Write a protein that binds this DNA or RNA. Structure first.
Lengths: 231, 95, 126, 126
RNA sequence: GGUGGGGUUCCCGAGCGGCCAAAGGGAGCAGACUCUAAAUCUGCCGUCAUCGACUUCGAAGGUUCGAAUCCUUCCCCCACCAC
């Protein structure tokens, strides 16, 4: 069970560990990332009992110059997220086949979440869709209606094409975070409970795959062990 | 020299190999050299003396290099070695 | 350009079109109709049912009106139409005439006589 | 006297008891909790779901709380608990601990340690 | 439902089956130049970043001594049609 949120204080994360949570993701939505924040993430993760995987995020830049610079800044960190309602950057983001999870098709667009050609290209390039929840807690009633209509449309377009889905709260403060049983009961309320469990299983397996990829000398899934001829 | 990075394009014939995981239960536990190689198939001669026909895409291989032991899927080894050294790019996602 | 392809009809949302009337001697703006039907569709469905049955008004010129629905849940939309009681000084009356799959057929069954096509001409002329 | 017999347990409503907490450093009255949970249970259920899942708060002394539910729809009540966003100057936080069939068991699993019985003594002494 | 077509470098665009042959232009970096800057010119031009060499011509399979090119399949992108 893996959450995606930002780190502010230690008591909040100590409350997170005491409930159910085994690990989470530190969320860098900025262009200024250094090793000091990641060392503070190490300190708060070793504070009580946890492991945290850090990522980086970009919003509203060019088409594929952004793709090259995003690869160059991605070569330092573990995982990544690209958010944006623009379809033009979304096509390149699902085309570059190296982004793990994808967010924001509903609030920058306000028309429809995922296109059919977009969902078929995501099936060929294996990019996952991340569903946020802070968008549900900063809107009005009919806005909640249109947003959950978009999520149910994207849920069908991910179910029929077997597109991987990761749920998160996309939190910002101490109290924006919610329970994992709550998110499981909500995704049970929407369509199905087995797919709700599959979302959490995929959320664990994608971080497991990124950790197993960047852990050792693994290139295109090739494991190399004792007595290497490494230059 | 044979490198663990270019083992996706190095020749497999003439290298000792054992497999560690496969869907076939009796396939697990073999040790031998590579003699013949087709598009998704190795012909492996055991030390005991039995020739076995091993499909690549169902198992993972551990090739024994000069000191090294490298674990590569046969899904990465898809294609004839002629076309594999031509150029084959395989990207695998075990989700 | 910002364009989204229509989903194939095996995958798109199966829809119905409810034709109804808002009976009163009083008058309404179509935005007031959209506001009252959003308040009522919340008050009968919550977030879950409003994600379920997909409410959107498509036409209101006269006190008659046409609204779009999901196919499996037209009875839920009708029950949402019943529980109108009051709008700020007065009620409005919502009375359903029927339900069909298109505008040309629901327009002639209860609403009118002829079959108009206006979307094509406002797309090709403008 | 005005008395109503309890329905037999084959015919009565199958119920569950959700234990939760309203996390904030701020304070609340139990009537404010009942008002906010009624507004939220309307905002997620409508008349149909509130007839469906039977919401009623039974206990609130601390920021912990106990509320009663139908048996088949505890996930709906939890999803009703998630969508709290704001109460007039501020949010409140609702965080579920668990769900059980009674007070003596849900009181010891997450809430406390001992098993109190107060209804019997306030019925027999008063 | 229908016809005539296109997909090549960050963006607009050429290219005989053959030596990064990959015309290129704009862009980035560096040099040169200038008091500074614009314009012009030079090299890297995706990488090593001096010559030079390797990769990408939407994707896969196949033909061939050898594929951007020739064949098949899977796709997408254009243009215009209700009268």
């Amino acid at each position: 069970r893996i959450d995606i949120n930002r780190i502010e204080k230690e008591e909040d994360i100590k409350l997170l560990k005491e409930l159910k949570w085994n690990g989470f993701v530190f969320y860098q939505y900025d262009d200024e990332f250094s090793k000091d924040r990641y060392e503070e993430v190490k300190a708060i993760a070793e504070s009580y009992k946890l492991k945290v995987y850090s990522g980086v995020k970009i919003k509203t830049e060019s088409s594929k110059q952004l793709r090259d610079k995003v690869k160059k800044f991605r070569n330092k960190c573990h995982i990544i997220l690209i958010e944006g309602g623009v379809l033009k950057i979304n096509r390149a983001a699902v085309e570059l086949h190296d982004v793990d999870i994808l967010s924001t098709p509903e609030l920058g667009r306000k028309d429809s979440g995922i296109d059919h050609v977009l969902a078929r290209l995501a099936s060929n390039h294996r990019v996952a869709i991340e569903l946020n929840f802070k968008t549900l807690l900063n809107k009005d009633g009919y806005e909640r209606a249109r947003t959950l209509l978009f999520f149910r449309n994207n849920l069908k377009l991910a179910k029929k094409f077997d597109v991987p889905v990761v749920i998160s709260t996309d939190a910002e403060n101490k109290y924006q975070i919610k329970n994992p049983y709550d998110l499981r009961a909500f995704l049970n309320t929407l369509v199905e409970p087995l797919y709700a469990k599959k979302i959490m299983e995929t959320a664990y397996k994608i971080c497991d795959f990124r950790d197993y990829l960047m852990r050792d000398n693994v290139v295109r899934y090739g494991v190399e062990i004792i007595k290497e001829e490494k230059e | 020299m044979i490198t663990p990075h270019n083992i996706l394009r190095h020749e497999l014939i003439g290298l000792k190999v054992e497999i560690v995981e496969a869907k076939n239960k009796a396939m697990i536990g073999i040790k031998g050299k590579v003699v013949d190689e087709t598009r998704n198939t190795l012909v492996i001669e055991k030390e005991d003396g039995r020739e076995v026909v091993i499909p690549k895409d169902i198992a993972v291989f551990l090739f024994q290099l000069k000191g090294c032991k490298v674990k590569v899927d046969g899904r990465l080894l898809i294609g004839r070695p002629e076309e594999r050294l031509k150029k084959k790019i395989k990207i695998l996602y075990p989700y | 350009i910002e364009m989204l392809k229509t989903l194939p009809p095996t995958l798109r949302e199966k829809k119905r079109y409810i034709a109804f009337k808002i009976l009163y001697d009083e008058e309404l703006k179509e935005g007031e109709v959209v506001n009252l039907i959003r308040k009522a569709v919340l008050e009968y469905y919550g977030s879950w049912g409003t994600s379920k049955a997909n409410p959107w008004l498509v036409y209101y010129d006269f006190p008659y009106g046409i609204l779009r629905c999901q196919r499996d849940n037209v009875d839920y939309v009708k029950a949402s139409l019943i529980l109108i009681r009051e709008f700020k000084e007065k009620p409005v009356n919502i009375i359903c005439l029927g339900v069909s799959g298109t505008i040309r057929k629901a327009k002639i069954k209860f609403l009118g006589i002829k079959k108009p096509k206006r979307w094509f001409v406002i797309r090709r002329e403008r």
